[PDB]
Amino acid sequence: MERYENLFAQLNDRREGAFVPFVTLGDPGIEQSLKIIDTLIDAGADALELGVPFSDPLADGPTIQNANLRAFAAGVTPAQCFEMLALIREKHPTIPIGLLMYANLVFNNGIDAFYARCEQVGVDSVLVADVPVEESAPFRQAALRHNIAPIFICPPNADDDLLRQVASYGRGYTYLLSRSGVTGAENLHHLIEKLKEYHAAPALQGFGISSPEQVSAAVRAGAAGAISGSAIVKIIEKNLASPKQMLAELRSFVSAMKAASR
Amino acid sequence: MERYENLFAQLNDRREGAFVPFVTLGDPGIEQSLKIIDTLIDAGADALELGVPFSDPLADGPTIQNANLRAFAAGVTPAQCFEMLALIREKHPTIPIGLLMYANLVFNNGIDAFYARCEQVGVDSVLVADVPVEESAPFRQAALRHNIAPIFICPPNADDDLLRQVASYGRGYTYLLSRSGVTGAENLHHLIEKLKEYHAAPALQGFGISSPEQVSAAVRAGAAGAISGSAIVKIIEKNLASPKQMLAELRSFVSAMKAASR
Amino acid sequence: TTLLNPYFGEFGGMYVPQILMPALNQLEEAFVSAQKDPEFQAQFADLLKNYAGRPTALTKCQNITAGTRTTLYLKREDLLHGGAHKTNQVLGQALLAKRMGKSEIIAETGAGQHGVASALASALLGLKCRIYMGAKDVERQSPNVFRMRLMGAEVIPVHSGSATLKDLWNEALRDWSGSYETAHYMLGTAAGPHPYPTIVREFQRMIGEETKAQILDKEGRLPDAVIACVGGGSNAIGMFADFINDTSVGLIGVEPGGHGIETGEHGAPLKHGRVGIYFGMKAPMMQTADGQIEESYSISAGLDFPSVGPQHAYLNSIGRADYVSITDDEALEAFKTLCRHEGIIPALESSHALAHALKMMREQPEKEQLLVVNLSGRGDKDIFTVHDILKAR
Amino acid sequence: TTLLNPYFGEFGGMYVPQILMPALNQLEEAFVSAQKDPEFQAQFADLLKNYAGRPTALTKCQNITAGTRTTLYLKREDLLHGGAHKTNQVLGQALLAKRMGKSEIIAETGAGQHGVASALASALLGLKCRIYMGAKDVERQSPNVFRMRLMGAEVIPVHSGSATLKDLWNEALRDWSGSYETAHYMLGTAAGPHPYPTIVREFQRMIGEETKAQILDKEGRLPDAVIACVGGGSNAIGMFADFINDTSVGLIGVEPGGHGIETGEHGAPLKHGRVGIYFGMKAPMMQTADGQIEESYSISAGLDFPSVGPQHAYLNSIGRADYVSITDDEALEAFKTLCRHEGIIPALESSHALAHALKMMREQPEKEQLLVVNLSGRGDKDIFTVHDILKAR
Ligand SMILES: O=P(O)(O)OCCCc1c[nH]c2ccc(F)cc12
Ligand SMILES: O=P(O)(O)OCCCc1c[nH]c2ccc(F)cc12
Ligand SMILES: *Cc1c(COP(=O)(O)O)cnc(C)c1O
Ligand SMILES: *Cc1c(COP(=O)(O)O)cnc(C)c1O
Ligand code: NA
Ligand code: NA
């Protein structure tokens, strides 16, 4: 497969930025999460960025720390995550699906085996938040042997040495970090340019993106789209006791962000 | 005066040991103490050994520590003690009266002035419990300038050097310590002999003497009599709420100890 | 890329978000130049001696080995200023920070000892210090809290997770990943991403260097073994480092066995845990089969880091050092024994090392052995803990 | 008769019951032979260095004299084993006892510091130790109690009087006056009957001797003044003794002023009390007009002996030393200031000396002066006391 190549071909022929929602799988329960994801896609998400519940989300702010805890409260495990993932790919054949992982979960049972399981379930990419490019060899090799794109973060403090590594090693999309700190709805031209100069996979901006003008702006800066997590997770958070409203609030945020990508 | 010389002349002409009760002045109140003393004398006491309430009775066991506290509870002061003392001498003209003092009370307003006040009130001797013979010069000099006999303790561990000092400096009576530790109803031939050989004032045995056979025995050993305090203080202690009984119990202990001196 | 090898064999590495690499490499580069900088050296040495009180005594136990052929020395880090060996390295790191131009220090603590040590070093050196601590430990470690604020340090309550060392550690990293330009993260043990395992060791290595000179003066020969407790690994690698090439000296690291290895409630990842990637490194850690990171349990709160320094995992794998465990009860017995026979109250962390040394002496009483126990700290801070356990029996 | 003069001018003496003279003269004679006994010396020196941790650092304050012309050094007795300077002399006295063939030690304590120090020295040296303590302090000084029994020492509750130092002291003398043949009474300060003021001074005098060598190495000259708190007088005479003939060095003793001299609630008998005879000596003491002995009051329980060593009363009368007072509030301000600017928590006893030194610096900030404060102990033990006072405001 080539879901990202193809989706970016399609988007470029209609001059549209990608809009990519992040949610924690299994938050707040498995069925509700499955419905939240179908609603996201129904609402216009061009691709999905999905978090697997981990015990120590060290690159994550409180909104998502709380989405990890809700998932564990529901009893979600990595295994259940992969079953969910195969149910998503069976329902939606062409949407690119990427995982946001922490290293211990990828390494735990064998790096190569984790990427074999991604390939069998239909995942298209994986970003390991605590594996810098300097430690990524074993990870990127196993992803390419299983046809998985290994996604790297291009941080605000990147030097030219890093830009080149990110462009040479990454596939699918380049994750463009909007600022320092951690995920959180509460808190780059040249990077973009150098990435295209060095032929990096199309960039997607993220961290802090919470409103529709932001989406329009990223595309304008040259990013090929934007990812947004905390602002979608907050909506789930607010409407925990009223599910119907949760989907209707979600549906509306998404189409507004999506419509801003055009 | 010469109350001790005279009392020991009298006792020797009738082959009798001296029986000397110790009580804390003002215990348990001034009037009751005055009555306890008249009862002691009435009962046969040949002389009195009287304690002035001090804050830190370091050579005294608990019975007498408690008699010091009762006296303070009553508000007895050194001054009140001297008035009591003049009332005792006015009622009983010939009984030898000795004070048991701690040093700070003698030194407080002038050593010589303390002994001048003893002389004016009719006291015959003073024993300062924490002044060893080695520090006693100023004390013994002031006592002899006011006709007061300075009493020294001859302890169980005395060497010959001490025996000689005690004999040369003491007057009235020699205080013979029955054991180490402190006063307390709960816990010497050669000493006696050496004292007479060196011409020491007649010895009086004390510390622990609590029963009549003890009195008989001291006299037999050569002591000229015995002092007893804790065993008299205990009687006061027991009968605190029944005064009449206190005197009747006291009256009987005394005559029994006195009759044992013959 | 790095100036020093970030790995000890397969363990170690720099597993942190890409955003933190520059801070780490900057920290590595400043340490390497501070290490060949004679002014730096002279300045760290002066504070250790005139301020922390080094060198610490090497005290020969008199009464406890009576009747055996064990001679036991205690390296007295309990006498260091602050009552624990952690003062040595926070002094070094605080100078380093100044040498980098940082003016703020981030630290995290559970029991509160590293917290107290970061706050005294910062008070002395003019640094503004913020310490993450669990919202509950603030309630029970009032004594330590009060000390830190007495020292001018800001104490920041955490409610994310259980307030276990794991979340304090994450809370602190998250903050550093936003303020590394002005703040220096003062990691508390010889673990975490490179170059931290190497820097805390070098800043603790005067422990072993003094012990070697002191045992050589008093006995004329190297010990048979030096023994140390291992919670994250810094007092132990501080004691071991200088003897690593003296191959006749055994190096023994003692992890807490808690209630007992069999129960699952212990804090001995090195020998009973599984290689994982967390705390910015690849090392043995307590974790579920699913890869979720777990807690370490110990009667001493100071031995609960659920992973262990990478140079210890590597010394164990090539067989240069041996690692054992000591349960709560054994550590309490050693704690009572040192008070009664030598008049020294030992921290309950250090009591684990001492109980291992006692077991060596007691198991084979006619074996002739010169042992050095690293008394990493004093146990005034554990008095209530030991009292209450003792009240309960 | 005695080998040494029991008086310093008019103060001192041996005012004890005749029964105790032989024990005192025996103690004097053993001290004189132990003093010219090179084995004795070598043995006391070895325990002080390998066991108690001497010499203690002489630390230069960096931050607190900022902006003045005062240079301030702290002699770090807070780093001694046990956290206070009292360890020096209980070690010496415990050896002395052994040298006399005694096998039991009697001590009394209020706060409990001397109690802890007697118990550790006895644990180490094989002596059986019994400590009188007030029935109430047992209730509040549980921490210290527990330490003493952890050390094998027997703690004996007293109910006679108020359980004030006065009654503990009497309780202990009474017991000694019955068991002096086997027990040695380990007096806690440089007061009491001869030869105790002379023996505790000689056993504390390495404080001043180290400070003199250390200040001479670091500044090339003697201090302008050495300052010390005075509760019974031992840390202060320990610091002063070696400088007594260096007539350019001021010797300043600081008594607790409590709530303030004017209130009557203080513990400054030396300058505000009257010569009396009690505690086996003739010295200034707190007493009523009637000659009843009274209490000393201070926020630090460790400065409450209501009399003061006789050599201090004599140094004051000939004008070789000067004695001042420092109130509770001033001592608390100095306590907070040292934690915040130097990272050292000082005992509240020692904080009185330090507050006097701060006042000297602050009153005349352009006066150039080299001051040495005797930091007699560490203040972990006072943390709750300072916290609670601070809670209340
Ligand atoms: O919208 P925000 O600010 O929540 O960013 C979330 C971006 C997707 C995201 C979720 N968790 C993460 C952890 C690490 C990382 F590098 C990226 C992410
Ligand atoms: O009977 P007993 O044991 O109470 O002794 C009392 C003897 C008289 C006595 C009372 N208090 C004293 C204090 C010191 C001292 F030398 C003698 C006495
Ligand atoms: C902190 C501490 C320890 C454990 O830390 P390591 O890094 O494992 O040495 C051990 N002992 C004491 C007294 C401590 O304070
Ligand atoms: C006991 C003590 C004192 C007071 O005793 P001195 O005999 O007066 O020195 C002072 N400081 C500390 C820390 C003490 O323990
Ligand atoms: Na560990
Ligand atoms: Na005093």
Short mmCIF file of C-alpha atoms and ligand atoms in Angstrom, two decimals, chain A residues 22 59-60 64 100 102 129 153 175 179 183-185 206-209 227-230, ligand 1:
data_model
loop_
_atom_site.label_atom_id
_atom_site.label_comp_id
_atom_site.label_asym_id
_atom_site.label_seq_id
_atom_site.Cartn_x
_atom_site.Cartn_y
_atom_site.Cartn_z
CA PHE A 22 -5.80 12.53 17.08
CA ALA A 59 5.30 13.92 25.79
CA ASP A 60 1.62 14.51 26.61
CA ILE A 64 -4.36 13.47 26.80
CA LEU A 100 1.23 7.52 18.10
CA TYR A 102 5.73 5.44 23.20
CA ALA A 129 7.34 9.84 20.54
CA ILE A 153 9.14 14.86 14.48
CA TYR A 175 5.49 15.58 11.76
CA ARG A 179 6.39 24.52 19.68
CA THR A 183 0.72 18.18 23.66
CA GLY A 184 -1.95 20.58 24.92
CA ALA A 185 -4.69 22.69 23.43
CA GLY A 206 0.76 19.68 15.16
CA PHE A 207 0.85 20.52 18.87
CA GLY A 208 -1.50 23.28 19.91
CA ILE A 209 -3.62 23.42 16.70
CA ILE A 227 -3.15 17.29 13.16
CA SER A 228 -5.24 18.23 16.22
CA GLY A 229 -5.65 16.15 19.39
CA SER A 230 -6.28 17.97 22.69
O1 LIG E 1 -3.21 19.00 19.59
P1 LIG E 1 -2.25 18.70 20.70
O2 LIG E 1 -1.46 19.89 21.14
O3 LIG E 1 -2.83 17.83 21.71
O4 LIG E 1 -1.12 17.86 19.95
C1 LIG E 1 -1.31 16.44 19.85
C2 LIG E 1 -0.56 15.95 18.60
C3 LIG E 1 -0.71 14.40 18.41
C4 LIG E 1 -0.15 13.80 19.66
C5 LIG E 1 -0.85 13.28 20.70
N1 LIG E 1 -0.01 12.84 21.68
C6 LIG E 1 1.28 13.09 21.27
C7 LIG E 1 2.46 12.83 21.94
C8 LIG E 1 3.63 13.17 21.33
C9 LIG E 1 3.62 13.78 20.07
F1 LIG E 1 4.81 14.07 19.57
C10 LIG E 1 2.44 14.06 19.37
C11 LIG E 1 1.24 13.71 20.00
#
